[PDB]
Enzyme design. Structure first.
Site, PDB file in Angstrom:
ATOM      1  N   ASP A 107       0.835  -1.189   0.000  1.00 19.02           N
ATOM      2  CA  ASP A 107       0.000   0.000   0.000  1.00 19.02           C
ATOM      3  C   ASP A 107       0.876   1.247   0.000  1.00 19.02           C
ATOM      4  O   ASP A 107       2.086   1.149  -0.177  1.00 19.02           O
ATOM      5  CB  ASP A 107      -0.934  -0.020   1.205  1.00 19.02           C
ATOM      6  N   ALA A 109       2.215   2.799   2.178  1.00 17.48           N
ATOM      7  CA  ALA A 109       3.239   2.789   3.216  1.00 17.48           C
ATOM      8  C   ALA A 109       4.134   1.566   3.145  1.00 17.48           C
ATOM      9  O   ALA A 109       5.311   1.626   3.482  1.00 17.48           O
ATOM     10  CB  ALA A 109       2.577   2.866   4.585  1.00 17.48           C
ATOM     11  N   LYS A 110       3.573   0.450   2.709  1.00 13.32           N
ATOM     12  CA  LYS A 110       4.337  -0.778   2.612  1.00 13.32           C
ATOM     13  C   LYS A 110       4.470  -1.239   1.157  1.00 13.32           C
ATOM     14  O   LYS A 110       3.484  -1.578   0.502  1.00 13.32           O
ATOM     15  CB  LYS A 110       3.662  -1.863   3.464  1.00 13.32           C
ATOM     16  N   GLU A 155      -1.540   0.166  -5.281  1.00 10.89           N
ATOM     17  CA  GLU A 155      -1.409   1.437  -4.559  1.00 10.89           C
ATOM     18  C   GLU A 155       0.057   1.898  -4.460  1.00 10.89           C
ATOM     19  O   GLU A 155       0.547   2.271  -3.394  1.00 10.89           O
ATOM     20  CB  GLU A 155      -2.031   1.319  -3.165  1.00 10.89           C
ATOM     21  N   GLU A 253     -10.674  -0.565  -6.117  1.00 15.28           N
ATOM     22  CA  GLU A 253     -11.113  -0.947  -4.791  1.00 15.28           C
ATOM     23  C   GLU A 253     -12.123   0.028  -4.226  1.00 15.28           C
ATOM     24  O   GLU A 253     -11.988   1.239  -4.403  1.00 15.28           O
ATOM     25  CB  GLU A 253      -9.931  -0.990  -3.835  1.00 15.28           C
ATOM     26  N   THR A 257     -19.711   0.119   4.742  1.00 15.81           N
ATOM     27  CA  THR A 257     -20.256  -0.590   5.895  1.00 15.81           C
ATOM     28  C   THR A 257     -21.771  -0.706   5.848  1.00 15.81           C
ATOM     29  O   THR A 257     -22.457   0.290   5.632  1.00 15.81           O
ATOM     30  CB  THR A 257     -19.913   0.145   7.172  1.00 15.81           C
ATOM     31  N   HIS A 266     -12.528  -9.577  15.804  1.00 19.19           N
ATOM     32  CA  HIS A 266     -11.354  -8.755  15.505  1.00 19.19           C
ATOM     33  C   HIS A 266     -11.848  -7.379  15.069  1.00 19.19           C
ATOM     34  O   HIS A 266     -12.569  -7.268  14.079  1.00 19.19           O
ATOM     35  CB  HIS A 266     -10.549  -9.369  14.359  1.00 19.19           C
ATOM     36  N   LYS A 272     -15.795   4.451  12.224  1.00 18.64           N
ATOM     37  CA  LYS A 272     -15.071   4.989  13.366  1.00 18.64           C
ATOM     38  C   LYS A 272     -15.193   6.505  13.360  1.00 18.64           C
ATOM     39  O   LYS A 272     -15.584   7.095  12.354  1.00 18.64           O
ATOM     40  CB  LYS A 272     -13.598   4.608  13.288  1.00 18.64           C
TER      41      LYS A 272
HETATM   42 CA   LIG Z   1     -14.075  -8.320  12.521  1.00 18.30          CA
END
Ligand SMILES: [Ca+2]
EC number: 3.2.1.-
Length: 386
Positions: A107, A109-110, A155, A253, A257, A266, A272
């Protein structure tokens, strides 16, 4: 009772795809999917009846540790890509091979290089990347998979296979591109970027790619309303790339929700505080979200070729109150976003945040594997709801 307003001007051959990369890991974990009727059925058959005509699959070089323990996130390798590919083709759906050119998540950052390319000089890494793509594709072809598109990187906003210099990045891009071209001329080559809200970000990247003569056909973008600005911006910024460089554009992509609940145990990525939620966190909201992105891409004109829903079936392997029993599955089959074994490759994130699914509340299927009415969005955008 789901309402979806017909997308005005939607082209008939508009790409309606989904990325179900985790499907294999989930299946081995005992997860099952059903259909409207409630009878057990192959998710791919269900996706087809839903109007989906494309399937995206992430591919990692070596998503395992020295001992063979998957890093998780679906443990996606060429093997699983072919398994998934075969099933998609069997259901009249094209495939979008998304090469991360990394052993794990790639992504903004990685962008770590595969352990195999770890300490290789640029010249040797470039040829390795070309070989990998070339071999991988030929392999899929042999399996008789219908490959329609290939994504060279995921990305790649600031790096690719351990490289961070745009001069060298472009060369890697052409290397992977070269392999695709040699494999089949009909296959579309796409580059994937994210964060379209960043002022002049895509304009700069498009220009840079052009300055280095990068050979690609599709300029792909991620789009998560939670952080990526308005749909008006998306449409606008993409139209520029199209008009100025004559490239096709699309959303690789996207998701939304449908519930605030986490039925996996998890913690989920959304919703949020601080995140933008223009639509209600409900099944109808989620449908609106998807319908609007399709509209936004379609408003680009001839260049807007499609939209890809990301992981619409990464549902829980078991109830949230079985955390301990789920952790076992996530770890054994890598049916979570990451396993503890990924610490060797990413000690930062996956290293001490490994666990289950973080997007089970963003799927088009419920926690029990049954399809939500929002799955019909792919058909309704064409006509609308009576
Ligand atoms: Ca979950």
């Amino acid at each position: 009772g789901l309402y979806v307003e017909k997308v005005s001007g939607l082209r008939k051959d508009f790409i309606k795809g989904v990325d179900v990369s985790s499907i294999i890991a989930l299946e081995e974990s005992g997860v099952a999917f059903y259909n409207e009727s409630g009878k057990k059925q192959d998710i791919f058959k269900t996706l087809k009846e839903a109007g989906v005509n494309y399937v995206r699959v992430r591919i990692w070089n070596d998503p395992y540790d020295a001992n063979g323990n998957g890093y998780g996130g679906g443990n996606n390798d060429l093997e699983k890509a072919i398994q998934i590919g075969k099933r998609a083709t069997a259901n009249g759906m094209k495939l979008l091979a998304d090469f991360h050119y990394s052993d794990f998540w790639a992504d903004p950052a990685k962008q770590k290089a595969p352990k195999a390319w770890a300490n290789l000089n640029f010249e040797d890494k470039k040829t390795a990347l070309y070989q990998y793509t070339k071999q991988s594709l030929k392999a899929m072809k042999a399996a008789g998979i219908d490959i329609g598109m290939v994504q060279v990187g995921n990305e790649t906003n600031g790096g690719l296979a351990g490289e961070t210099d745009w001069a060298k990045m472009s060369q890697l891009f052409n290397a992977g591109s070269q392999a695709v071209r040699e494999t089949d001329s009909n296959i579309l080559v796409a580059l994937h970027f994210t964060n379209p809200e960043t002022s002049g970000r895509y304009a700069w990247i498009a220009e840079t790619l052009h300055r280095h003569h990068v050979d690609y056909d599709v300029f792909a973008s991620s789009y998560y309303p939670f952080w990526h600005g308005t749909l008006k911006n998306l449409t606008s910024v993409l139209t520029s790339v199209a008009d100025t460089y004559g490239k096709k554009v699309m959303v690789a992509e996207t998701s939304y929700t449908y519930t605030a609940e986490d039925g996996d145990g998890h913690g989920n990525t959304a919703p949020k505080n601080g995140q933008t939620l223009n639509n209600p966190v409900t099944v109808q909201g989620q449908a609106n979200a998807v319908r609007d992105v399709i509209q936004a891409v379609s408003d680009v004109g001839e260049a807007g070729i499609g939209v890809f829903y990301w992981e619409p079936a990464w549902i829980p392997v078991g109830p949230a109150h079985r955390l301990e029993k789920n952790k076992a599955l996530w770890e054994t089959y890598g049916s979570g976003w990451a396993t503890s074994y990924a610490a060797e490759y990413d000690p930062e994130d996956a290293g001490k945040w490994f666990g289950g699914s973080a997007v089970d509340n963003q799927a088009l299927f419920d926690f029990k594997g049954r399809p939500l009415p929002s799955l019909h969005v792919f058909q309704y955008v064409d006509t609308g709801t009576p």
